[PDB]
Write an enzyme that holds these catalytic residues in place. Sequence first.
Site, short mmCIF file in Angstrom:
data_model
loop_
_atom_site.label_atom_id
_atom_site.label_comp_id
_atom_site.label_asym_id
_atom_site.label_seq_id
_atom_site.Cartn_x
_atom_site.Cartn_y
_atom_site.Cartn_z
NE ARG A 194 -3.24 2.33 2.98
CZ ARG A 194 -2.84 3.30 3.89
NH1 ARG A 194 -1.77 3.18 4.78
NH2 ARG A 194 -3.72 4.57 4.10
CE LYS A 244 -8.73 5.31 3.16
NZ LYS A 244 -7.55 6.29 2.85
#
Lengths: 505, 515, 504, 514
Positions: C60, C243
């Site tokens: 990430r 998200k």
Amino acid sequence: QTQQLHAAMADTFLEHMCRLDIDSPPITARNTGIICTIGPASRSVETLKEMIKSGMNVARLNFSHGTHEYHAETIKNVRTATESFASDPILYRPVAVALDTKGPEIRTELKKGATLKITLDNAYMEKCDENILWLDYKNICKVVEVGSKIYVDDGLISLQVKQKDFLVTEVENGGSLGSKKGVNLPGAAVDLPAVSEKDIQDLKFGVEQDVDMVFASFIRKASDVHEVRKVLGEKGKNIKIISKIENHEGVRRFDEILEASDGIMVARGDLGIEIPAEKVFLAQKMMIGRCNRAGKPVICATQMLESMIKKPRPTRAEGSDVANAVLDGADCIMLSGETAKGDYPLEAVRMQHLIAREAEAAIYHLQLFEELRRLAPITSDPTEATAVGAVEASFKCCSGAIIVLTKSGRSAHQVARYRPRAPIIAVTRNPQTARQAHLYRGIFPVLCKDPVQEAWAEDVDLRVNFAMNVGKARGFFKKGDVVIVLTGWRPGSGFTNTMRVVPVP
Amino acid sequence: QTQQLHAAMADTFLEHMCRLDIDSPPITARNTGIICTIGPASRSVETLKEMIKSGMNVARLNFSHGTHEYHAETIKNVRTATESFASDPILYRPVAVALDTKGPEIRTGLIKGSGTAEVELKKGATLKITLDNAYMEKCDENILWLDYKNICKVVEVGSKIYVDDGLISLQVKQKGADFLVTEVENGGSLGSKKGVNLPGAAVDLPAVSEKDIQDLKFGVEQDVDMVFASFIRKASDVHEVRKVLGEKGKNIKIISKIENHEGVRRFDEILEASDGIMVARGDLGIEIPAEKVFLAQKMMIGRCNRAGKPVICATQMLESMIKKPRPTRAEGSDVANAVLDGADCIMLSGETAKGDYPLEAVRMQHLIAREAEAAIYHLQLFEELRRLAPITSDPTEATAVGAVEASFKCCSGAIIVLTKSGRSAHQVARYRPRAPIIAVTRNPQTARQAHLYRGIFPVLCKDPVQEAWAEDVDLRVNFAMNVGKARGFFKKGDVVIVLTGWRPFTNTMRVVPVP
Amino acid sequence: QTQQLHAAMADTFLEHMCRLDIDSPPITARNTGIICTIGPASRSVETLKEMIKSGMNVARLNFSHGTHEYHAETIKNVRTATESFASDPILYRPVAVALDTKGPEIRTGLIKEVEATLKITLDNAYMEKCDENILWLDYKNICKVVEVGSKIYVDDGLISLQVDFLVTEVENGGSLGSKKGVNLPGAAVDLPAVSEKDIQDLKFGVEQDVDMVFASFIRKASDVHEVRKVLGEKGKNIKIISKIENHEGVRRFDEILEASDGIMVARGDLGIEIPAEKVFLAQKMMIGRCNRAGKPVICATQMLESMIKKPRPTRAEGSDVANAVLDGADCIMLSGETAKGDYPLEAVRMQHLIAREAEAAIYHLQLFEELRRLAPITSDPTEATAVGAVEASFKCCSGAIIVLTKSGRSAHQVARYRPRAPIIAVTRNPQTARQAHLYRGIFPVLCKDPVQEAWAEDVDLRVNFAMNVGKARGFFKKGDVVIVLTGWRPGSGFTNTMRVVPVP
Amino acid sequence: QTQQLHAAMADTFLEHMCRLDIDSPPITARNTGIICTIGPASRSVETLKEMIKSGMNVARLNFSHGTHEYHAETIKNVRTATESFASDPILYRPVAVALDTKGPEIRTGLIKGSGTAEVELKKGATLKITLDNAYMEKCDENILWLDYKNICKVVEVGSKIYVDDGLISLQVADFLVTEVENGGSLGSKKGVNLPGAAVDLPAVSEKDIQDLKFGVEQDVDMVFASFIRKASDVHEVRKVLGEKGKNIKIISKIENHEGVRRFDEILEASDGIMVARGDLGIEIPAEKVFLAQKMMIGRCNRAGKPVICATQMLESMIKKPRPTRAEGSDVANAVLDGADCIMLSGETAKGDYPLEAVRMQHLIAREAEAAIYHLQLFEELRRLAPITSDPTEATAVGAVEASFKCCSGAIIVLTKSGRSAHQVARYRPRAPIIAVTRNPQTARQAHLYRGIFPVLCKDPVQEAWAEDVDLRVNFAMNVGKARGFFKKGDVVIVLTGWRPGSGFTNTMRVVPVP
């Protein structure tokens, strides 16, 4: 809207009941095998043809009466009628032949309270009366005890033992006694042979006549099944043995009997003489349940549509009895006097067909499939895993059928035990397998007569396509419907391992 | 060991079935009410007393036949027989009286002036149906009179007409203005005054006729407990019956009989307007295909269980016992499965009214019902009833479900409920406890009508009200204990659940030992 | 005696719990994808190799900070490390690259720190003169989104206030610094779905061939569409994971999920935007709905937070990771623990160990039963094949479910039914192999063998590749039975064949 | 729309999860007991009053540290704070006192002669362990004294040695030579663990004997017995407590592998269990602790005995005013697992935010209690329940069933010994259990059970027993109203008996609030 699919979606059984809908029509396919007793009313080639068209899958021959020459002619007529549809293999329906044995028997006004002496002394063989009653069961004193009940003449007359070559009895339930009446000993471990001398000759004749299955009368223990198996011998090693449970000992020792047998008949007539009639439904539901748990065929028998021997429509209790046998989980239902001697044999078969088809749609598969899996052992067997996979897939896409290639029938049997909604089209080249498959709920057996293709994978595909033609021709499904197909990775039995979801061409 | 408790513990229905045991005897108590049709075979006080001892809970009178004079006599005999046991209050059993209406029936005339004469109808033969009352008592194999004057307006060519429990079948070949020519499909013996069904047709007879009105008012005057209203097709049919009963008959329970396709279609609105339902399987299995009756039965029983309203399974349950001393295996099965389905009551018609073995038929339903009740899978049933039951602010509902849960936990010998209107005991019954519900009431009608609910064993307390309320409660509770012991439902040292009020609304549950 | 099989056979969840056994060792397979945030502590090629060996499946990149030049180099290093194992394709593990966007933010101005009334001003005069009396914000619409009484958090929830100007009362005081992040609990923030920086960063993502985007601060379905639109045709195969960071995102979760490829439970910001005691509710709801939809869900933030400073986690942290897996999370994540912390490798190893134990402790009996009941009855062949495969895998306790897949979809369909057996997804598509890590149970393998002339032989070659991977990885051995999924012709969309096959 | 009632009615657990609603607010009542370790941060009467107002139900005293004088004063302060609220019995909240034993601990010595001195160990360096008491107050970077005299007999070469919550790691006549496998700051008197070794210290040391005697003298409500390995350890503590301590509840702390192995016999012998995850997660692999926790909570729920989840639940709050997301999750999940109580250690004993940590546990527990899937939980408890002819158990299960049917505001239970209320708590009702007792010890000890809100009736005994019963029932009504558990017109369940004395609870009523 069709086949009770609204009810199928209920999250509870109660709500499932509440949604059952008399205006939700079922599918064409009827999963429950119908066994018809053949006799004077149904014996002709021409009537047998109509019996098949009406839905008969198995012709039962009751060997309690009739000669070998007589039964040989009935079998010949059954096969004449059956093969009259053979010209079109797509529409041909296999029909099995079942031999039901006479089995071991005990044979012989009377007021209640009166005293009757049972004599084994051969001197009174032809001189039975209100004081002395002769019986042919020599060991009766060894199996009964003071206070034991003895039934005479299909349970009409009841005696109680007071003193135990003789037994002093008091008449508990009285009536007109007669000659050569049948005797039952509730709760007694009757030690008569597993097969009589007559049975041995009859079973050998069964092998001669190439019968598909034997319904073995009065089975009490696993060793009785083994004796029937031994008589059938190497030559009859592939004939299915269906044990008839007819008395208390058979019920108590049911687990060992089931293990040794190919299937079970709940023989309700005699069972309700041997135990209180009000308990028979417990015995039936227990045996159907345990057979379902074992994946072995179970037949519900006797008086299911009794009134139709004389009337063109059944009673409401009879309609209910047939539907509930199917809902209990019976693989097959049976007709006795209704088809053997009655005035309405065709109507009786058609009614069993209609009720079974309605009842199959009303099954709560959601819970039923859930419970069968949970109680299904984890094994390393590839065919079992493939079969459970196929049934789960059939539910997920509401498939029109599960098509299964099988030599011995076993692969289709393994699918059947999981109780799919979809019909199971079992394609075989083995004619006996095709006939014996009627013992299993949901199996619609088809006999492929095509030559073996030179490339084995093409031969597999040919048989699958044959099943597609059968389903289309019989209205089980149409072009564009999805079906589940089960095949194996190589020829020979024991290798079923492939499940495919395919469109009907 | 007993009451199929081993099967009761199974974690799946399939394993429950596998565990059903013919050597596990049931309890003495029988929860399913038995309704007996009274007729020549069962009408004398002498025989009624045996009917009661054998297990009859409700006497059904069929007003399709008989005069008011005759029915008044029957009712008097039922009461005389019932009250003969009143001198030992512990052994007295309340018995309800039900009036079953004729309703919109269609009937044929007399064969050749005789009530007993018959003619043979041969398949393919011709048969003319007439409305001309000259032939009203001159029916034969050529001409058949029927009493439905408007039949021609509601039939067409090709329509099927059924006679005598649907056993004789005709097809309209030609229509007329006041007649029909038909062809016999299904032949057989044709007798006098047989019932006629027109399954295809929208029959336009009154839901409540002038005769029905007369019979219902007679029902009020005679203090009947309930009315079985025949051929209910919709809510407004039920409202008309309710209107005739009026304020004076407002406490009489109306049980709607579902015996045609419209009754099934419109079941929900009928159930809402009714106090209960009868699955009238005789006509129902002629009006719809016989193979679909089990679907309608299970649907209606399920919906009644869900609504908490009494449901009766009726007709041909033990049919062969009209002529034979014991039933067939299908009949045995039918009685058991009606109970397993959830029927509050089961019924006998010809078996008790006219047959050779009325007492035997009653005894057999008693024996089967008790076995079936033990074989119920209460674990799932109770779970589903609780789940499908709304969570409410009603204290009596909460006490009732608590009492049933408590009865399962200690496998109690009974749930004793002190009740004036019966409501408290009905509320317990709808959750289907295994334990018998001994409902102690001082209200005679409450005690009689309680028989409509599975599990309720009504007992009528005739003792005066005590000055001290605690002592009056204890008197009634101990009354239930003494009935239970006398009937063999339980013994000293067993545990029972007791439901009462707390102060002089049922909201108190006590777990108490039998003295 | 292994894999919590005794607990597996329990008839109730209570009995299942009671049978959980610390001496019942797990199988080798670990199904839950581990997503590691890369930063100073884990950015080197040599550390990245160890991260892969320790169990990292997804690298990430947090674009909240760092230049394109910086992140380009991180990606290059990830690829160097990943491809250093490429020689042996039987043991090669695909590693995915994820771009996590900075997203829309509300920031305060420059002070002159400062430690009661406090006025919020949008007047750019106060832009570099923030103090105890006046605080400037860069969110011009703030007055439209807030009302009298509405709360305002400043600097990662540290400071709290109660309300073209706003007059507020300090609820929770502290040191107020420069350029701090602001949160508006309950408010419908109307900032663009994608900031100007995001637009440039997402273009960079497409150029760099990233596997997936973690799109910050998704509040509604239209935010997803805008991200999808910015990624465009060139980025059409890049997965979008929304998200969920605030109350609106939770309220409008169903529409966000439908539009998204997957979901991240962004617990840090979520626990500022809603009461922190309610986050577990939001987590369990979102994981449940994602499982129901068969879309990947990631649990994120502070899972092993103490391991930034310490070589072992707290007991609450051990618990949190296990419970995320038990809840149904497809992936678990590490942020500061692997980006900046002193024990990056230990943190990855601990998620691996806990994940593996937790997967064995799943009550598959009930889980699978429920997934089936809620499984829509449709005519789709691949769906019916997938559920049939999972049912079969339970019935014969198979060593694996092998799935040939081009796009990954066939293996995703198996994954949603939560088999215990590892799903070996064999593909020739490198991106599919990387993206498959988003799904619980998928062990992706990249077949590098040439396309055989006869398709049937090419199919068999790939099944045999999967057999070799499983044998080498200790999933199963010769003679064991596995499930194999294949299709009826080449190309995507034709999976229809389930076989029970002995391992050669 | 409240108390997660929409999720409550889901037909599957999956759908239950899907329906969990952050906008569905909980009820007022919080069922899960909160145990707070008292220390320098929370010792004052002033702070203890706020701890009580914030939700503290049990004060834990850790006898690993502190003298009897110190603990006697802490106890005195707890009672002063608690009894400051006694003037109104309606609002008085009982607070229990728990003595947590030192047990068979291994501790290091003093760093350079001081209890707060530290030396920063470097990763890779070498360190000698000695048993020579010459160095017991001169530990440093190079030499480390331990108090486990018999240490050398039970460990071999290559053994791993852990210091200070397993954070420092080391590899091996009266000494050992080691290399620092994991480094960091080394302080004074830190706990040492020997995971692969059979430590042979006594179940009940001389110190433990002294401490248990003190516990009896100080009228403590419960003992938390450290490092219980087997049933015989529990019997030993029980026997030491003897007849004078016969009513003191023994909670066995499971903190090692043997304790997990022999858990069934330990549970049988104990009054309850603590999952002591701190040492447990050093003695066994940290990744297996959740398995041990869920197993123990499950088996305790099955047996109907209190279980406590302990250690690092909100650890970050020792230094920070808010917890991490993993901590929030851990507390919620401990409640969802079925733990009767949750615990704070350093968070309340020494940390900078003791009141915030208590308040946070209170907020999370209440949210999580609403999120329990009672439908399945209750169904499984009923099924797993041993079937009995016991009338008290039948009344308890009926009361719980009734409470669900009418979503009751509470279940009011009269109890002398607590048993009747414990029997209700066993079936895990949603509604709070208001346990009315005149026995102060019963009131305090009742906090061990999920759902029990004990209230201490101080009204005199009425001549007429029935009126004495109605008196206490109405006291419960007044408490529930005052606490906002329910108001006039709500329905509550009430459990009473048919006669005085313990063991006669048999009457369940469904009554409206006056």
